[PDB]
C-alpha cells in the first residue's frame, strides 16, 4: 500500500522528476569532505540540548539567598542566573549530563569549523566560483565564537564575570565612541540589570537565527554547485566522480551523524566541563589565578597580554594600550575574510576552478597557512601562559617575551620549513614517475654492483630507463603494497579457512572486478582527452 502513498504525493506536487535528480546527485568520497558534517551535527546537538536547557534557566541578575540542592553553597547571596544554573546541575535528573553535552558540543562545533576552514584553505576550494561560501563560512566562525562567548557568560559565576568585566572595559576604552557604546550595550555602568537579559536573548534567539540562516544558505549553495574533487583518474573539471545520494551517501551521512552524537554523549558523562559549583557568584573584588576564557576566545585574550604599554596621551585625552589590540584583531579578521581576493590579486588567476589541488603543489599558500596557524597558536598559548608557566616550570615573564618575540620569529621559521618541505614532497613525487617505485629489493649484479629493483608505472623503452610520466595533480604510489603486492591470498576467518572451491572461485571474481574497475578509469580518461581536444 506504498504505491498509493506515492500516487497521492505525485498527483499533487508533480514531484517524480524533481526528486529523481535529488537522489541521483553524486558526491566525491574523501575523508576530508566529511569535516563540514561534524560542524553541522555539533550544531544540531547545540540547538536540541540548548532548548532543553532553557526550561530550567532564569536569566536574571536579581540577588537571592540560595537554598537549593548544593548544600556547600546554601545561605550565600547569588543572582537568579547562577542559582538556576546550579539547579540544572544539582536538582534536575540528568541536567548536569545535558549541560556538559551542551558545552562539549560548543567546543566541538568551533573546532569542527576551524578544521573545515583549514581543509577549504589548503586544498584551494575557496576559488571561483566559491568565494561566497568562504565569506559566509568566515562570518559563521566569528559568530560561532561570539555565540560560545555569550553562552559561557550566562551562569554569572566568578570565572565568566571577569570575562564580561574585560569585555566591557575593552569597549569603554574605544577612542571616540567608547563610553557611549558601553552605555548602549549594557544599558549603563557594568554590571547592569538588563545585561544578562540582552546576553540571553542574543544567545538563544538572535545569533542562532542568523547562524541557522547562514548555514542553510551555505548548504544550499554547496548543493547547487555540486562539489570540488581532487584531480584523480578519469576526473575532469566538467564531471563529478563519487557516489549517488541513495542508497550510499544518505546512509553514510546518518552513520557518521550517530557517531558524532554518540561521542558527544560519551564526553558529556565521562569528563567534567565548566564546574561552576567550585567557582562562586560573581564579585567584582575577588578573582582567581589564570581565569582564561574558552579555547576559541584565547587568541583575543593572548593578544592583550603581548601588546606592550603603548598609551597615547593627547591633550586631555587618552588612547588606552588595549586599542592597538583591537586594531590587530581587526586586521586578522579582515585578512581572513578577503583571502580569495588577495590570492587572485597576487597570482593573477581568475579561472573557473572545479578541481582541487594538493597542499604540496601550492607551497606559498600552504606556507602562509602554516605561518598563520603558528600565529594563532602562539596567541592561544600566550592567552593561557599562566597555566603553562605554573605546570611546566617556566618564568611567566619569559612566557610573555616568548609570545612577543615568537610572533615575529615563529611565523618566519614556519614559512621557511613548510615551503622547503612542500618542494621536498613535490620532488619525491617526480622521482617515482621518472624512475618507478623503489621496491627495496637490493640485489647484486655479477660484476658486484648493488642495484635496487625499480617498478615502472608506465611503459619502458629498450635501455632500462623508462620514459618518465608527467605530473597529473594526483597522488602517485610510493610503496609496493599500495599496488596490492602484499594482499592476503587467504579467504576465511581467524581459526579456520574456507573450502578450496569457494576460495579460488572468490579470488577469480575479485581479480576480474578490480581489473574492470581500473578499465572504467582508463576509458574515462580516453573520452576526456577527446572531450578536451574540442
Partner 1 sequence: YTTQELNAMSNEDLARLGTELDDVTIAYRKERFPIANDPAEKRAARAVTFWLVLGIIGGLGFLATYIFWPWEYKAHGDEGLLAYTLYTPMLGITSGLCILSLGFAVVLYVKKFIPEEIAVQRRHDGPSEEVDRRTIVALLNDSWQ
Partner 2 sequence: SGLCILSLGFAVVLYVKKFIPEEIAVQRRHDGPSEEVDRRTIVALLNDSWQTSTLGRRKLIMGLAGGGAVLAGLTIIAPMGGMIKNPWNPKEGPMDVQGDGTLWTSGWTLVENDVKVYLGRDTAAIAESHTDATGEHWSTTGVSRLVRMRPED
Ligand X SMILES: CCCCCCCCCCCCCCCC(=O)O[C@H](COC(=O)CCCCCCC[C@@H](C)CCCCCCCCC)COP(=O)(O)O[C@H]1[C@H](O)[C@H](O)[C@@H](O)[C@@H](O)[C@@H]1O
Ligand Y SMILES: CCCCCCCCCCCCCCCC(=O)OC[C@H](C)OC(=O)CCCCCCCC[C@@H](C)CCCCCCCC
Long-range contacts of 401-408 (CB under 8 A, 24+ apart): 403/302, 403/305, 403/306, 403/378, 403/379, 404/306, 404/308, 406/378, 406/382, 407/306, 407/375, 407/378, 407/379
Q: Which residue number, 189 or 508, has a Cβ lying nearer to partner 1?
A: 508
What's the grid cell of residue 103?
A: 558545552
Residue 493 contacts partner 1 per CB under 8 A:
yes
Q: Cell numbers 569528563 correspond to what residue?
A: 271
From the list 69, 188, 189, 223, which residue makes contact with ligand CDL (rule: CB under 6 A)?
Answer: 223
Contacts with its own copies in 127-186 (CB under 8 A)? 128-129, 131-132
Instruction: Count other Cβ atoms within 10 Å, centred on residue 79.
Output: 24
What's the grid cell of residue 275?
A: 564546574
Q: Which residue number, 359 or 369, has a Cβ lying nearer to ligand Y?
A: 369
From the list 142, 205, 219, 312, which residue makes contact with ligand Y (rule: CB under 6 A)?
Answer: 312
Residues 249-268 vs ligand HEM: string with x where CB under 6 A? --------------------
Residue 7 contacts ligand CDL per CB under 6 A:
no
Contacts with ligand X in 35-94 (CB under 6 A)? 91-93
Count, residues near ligand HEM per rule CB under 6 A: 54
- Alpha helices by DSSP H, listed for 16-94, are 16-20, 35-53, 80-90
- 200, 153 contact by CB (below 8 A): no
Residues 37-66 vs ligand HEM: string with x where CB under 6 A? x-xx-----xx--xx-xx--x---------
Three-state secondary structure call for residue 213 = helix
From the list 13, 180, 223, 310, which residue makes contact with ligand MQ9 (rule: CB under 6 A)?
Answer: 223
The residues that bridge with 157 in the sheet, in sequence order, are 281
Which span (18-26, 190-198, 443-451, 498-506) binds ligand CDL, by CB under 6 A?
Answer: 18-26
Residue 331 contacts ligand Y per CB under 6 A:
yes
Which phi-psi region, left, alpha or beta, contains residue 94 (left: φ > 0; alpha: ψ -120 to 50)? Answer: left
Contacts with partner 1 in 499-518 (CB under 8 A)? 502, 505-506, 509, 513, 516-517
Burial 139-171 (b: 16+ CB within 10 A, else e): ebbeebbbbbbbbbbbbbbbbbbbbbeebbebb
User: Which of ligand Y, ligand X, ligand MQ9, none interacts with 214 (beta carbon under 5 to 8 A by kind)?
Assistant: ligand MQ9
> Smallest distance, Å, CB 379 to its own copies?
33
Residue 212 contacts ligand Y per CB under 6 A:
no
Element (H, E) at 437: strand 437-444
Residue 44 contacts ligand CDL per CB under 6 A:
no
Instruction: Count other Cβ atoms within 10 Å, centred on residue 265.
Output: 16
Task: Give dist(CA 135, CA 133) in Å, integer.
Answer: 6
Q: List, in order, residues 6 or more apart from 500 with CB less than 8 Å away.
A: none
Residue 30 labelled as part of a binding site: no
Q: Which residues bind ligand HEM (CB under 6 A)?
A: 33-37, 39-40, 46-47, 50-51, 53-54, 57, 85, 88, 99, 102-103, 106, 109, 113, 116-117, 120, 125-126, 130, 133-134, 137-138, 140-141, 144, 147-148, 151-152, 154-155, 203-205, 208, 211, 215, 218-219, 222, 225, 227-228, 274
Q: Detail the residues annotated as belonging to a binding site.
A: 102, 116, 203, 218
Q: Detail the residues annotated as belonging to a binding site for heme.
A: 102, 116, 203, 218
Amino acid at each position: 500500500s506504498l504505491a498509493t502513498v506515492g500516487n497521492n504525493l505525485d498527483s499533487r506536487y508533480t514531484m517524480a522528476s524533481g526528486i529523481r535528480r535529488q537522489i541521483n546527485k553524486v558526491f566525491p568520497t574523501h575523508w576530508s569532505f566529511m569535516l563540514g558534517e561534524i560542524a553541522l551535527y555539533s550544531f544540531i546537538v547545540l540547538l536540541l540540548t540548548g532548548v532543553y536547557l532553557t526550561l530550567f534557566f532564569d536569566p536574571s541578575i536579581t540577588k537571592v539567598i540560595y537554598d537549593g540542592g548544593y548544600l556547600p553553597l546554601n545561605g550565600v547571596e547569588m543572582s537568579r542566573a547562577y542559582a538556576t544554573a546550579l539547579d540544572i546541575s544539582f536538582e534536575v535528573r540528568g541536567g548536569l549530563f545535558i549541560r556538559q553535552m551542551h558545552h562539549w558540543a560548543a567546543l566541538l562545533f568551533v573546532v569542527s569549523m576551524l578544521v573545515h576552514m583549514l581543509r577549504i584553505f589548503f586544498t584551494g576550494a575557496f576559488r571561483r566560483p566559491r568565494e561566497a561560501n568562504w565569506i559566509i563560512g568566515v562570518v559563521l566562525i566569528i559568530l560561532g565564537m561570539a555565540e560560545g562567548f555569550m553562552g559561557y557568560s550566562l551562569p554569572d559565576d566568578l570565572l565568566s564575570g571577569v570575562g564580561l568585566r574585560i569585555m566591557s572595559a575593552i569597549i569603554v576604552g574605544l577612542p571616540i565612541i567608547g563610553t557611549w557604546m558601553h552605555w548602549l550595550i549594557f544599558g549603563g555602568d557594568f554590571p547592569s540589570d538588563l545585561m544578562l537579559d540582552r546576553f540571553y536573548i542574543a544567545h538563544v534567539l538572535i545569533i542562532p537565527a542568523i547562524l541557522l540562516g547562514l548555514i542553510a544558505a551555505h548548504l544550499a549553495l554547496v548543493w547547487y554547485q555540486k562539489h570540488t574533487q581532487f584531480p584523480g583518474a578519469g576526473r575532469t573539471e566538467n564531471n563529478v566522480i563519487g557516489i549517488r545520494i541513495m542508497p550510499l551517501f544518505a546512509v553514510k551521512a546518518v552513520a557518521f551523524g550517530l557517531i558524532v552524537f554518540g561521542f558527544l554523549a560519551l564526553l558529556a558523562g565521562v569528563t567534567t566541563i565548566n564546574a561552576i559549583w567550585n567557582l562562586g557568584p560573581y564579585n567584582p573584588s575577588q578573582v582567581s589565578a589564570g581565569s582564561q576564557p574558552d579555547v576559541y576566545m584565547l587568541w583575543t585574550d593572548g593578544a592583550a597580554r603581548v601588546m606592550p604599554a603603548w598609551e597615547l596621551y593627547l591633550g586631555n585625552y587618552t588612547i588606552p594600550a588595549v586599542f592597538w589590540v583591537a586594531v590587530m584583531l581587526g586586521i586578522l579578521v579582515v585578512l581572513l575574510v578577503t583571502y580569495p581576493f588577495i590570492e587572485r590579486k597576487f597570482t593573477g588567476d581568475d579561472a573557473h576552478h572545479n578541481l582541487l589541488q594538493r597542499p604540496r603543489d601550492v607551497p606559498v599558500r600552504t606556507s602562509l597557512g602554516v605561518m598563520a596557524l603558528v600565529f594563532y597558536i602562539l596567541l592561544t598559548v600566550s592567552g593561557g601562559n599562566d597555566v603553562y608557566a605554573m605546570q611546566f616550570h617556566v618564568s611567566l615573564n619569559a612566557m610573555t617575551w616568548i609570545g612577543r618575540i615568537g610572533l615575529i620569529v615563529g611565523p618566519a621559521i614556519a614559512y621557511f620549513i613548510t615551503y622547503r618541505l612542500c618542494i621536498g614532497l613535490q620532488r619525491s613525487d617526480r622521482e617515482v614517475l621518472e624512475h618507478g617505485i623503489e621496491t627495496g629489493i637490493i640485489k647484486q649484479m655479477p660484476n658486484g654492483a648493488f642495484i635496487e629493483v625499480h617498478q615502472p608505472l608506465g611503459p619502458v623503452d629498450d635501455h632500462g630507463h623508462p620514459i618518465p610520466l608527467p605530473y597529473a595533480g594526483a597522488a602517485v604510489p610510493k610503496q609496493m603494497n599500495q599496488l596490492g603486492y602484499a594482499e592476503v591470498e587467504t579467504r576465511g576467518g581467524f581459526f579456520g579457512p574456507d573450502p578450496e572451491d569457494i576460495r579460488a572461485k572468490a579470488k577469480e571474481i575479485e581479480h576480474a572486478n578490480h581489473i574492470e574497475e581500473a578499465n572504467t578509469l582508463r576509458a574515462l580518461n580516453e573520452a576526456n582527452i577527446e572531450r578536451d581536444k574540442n
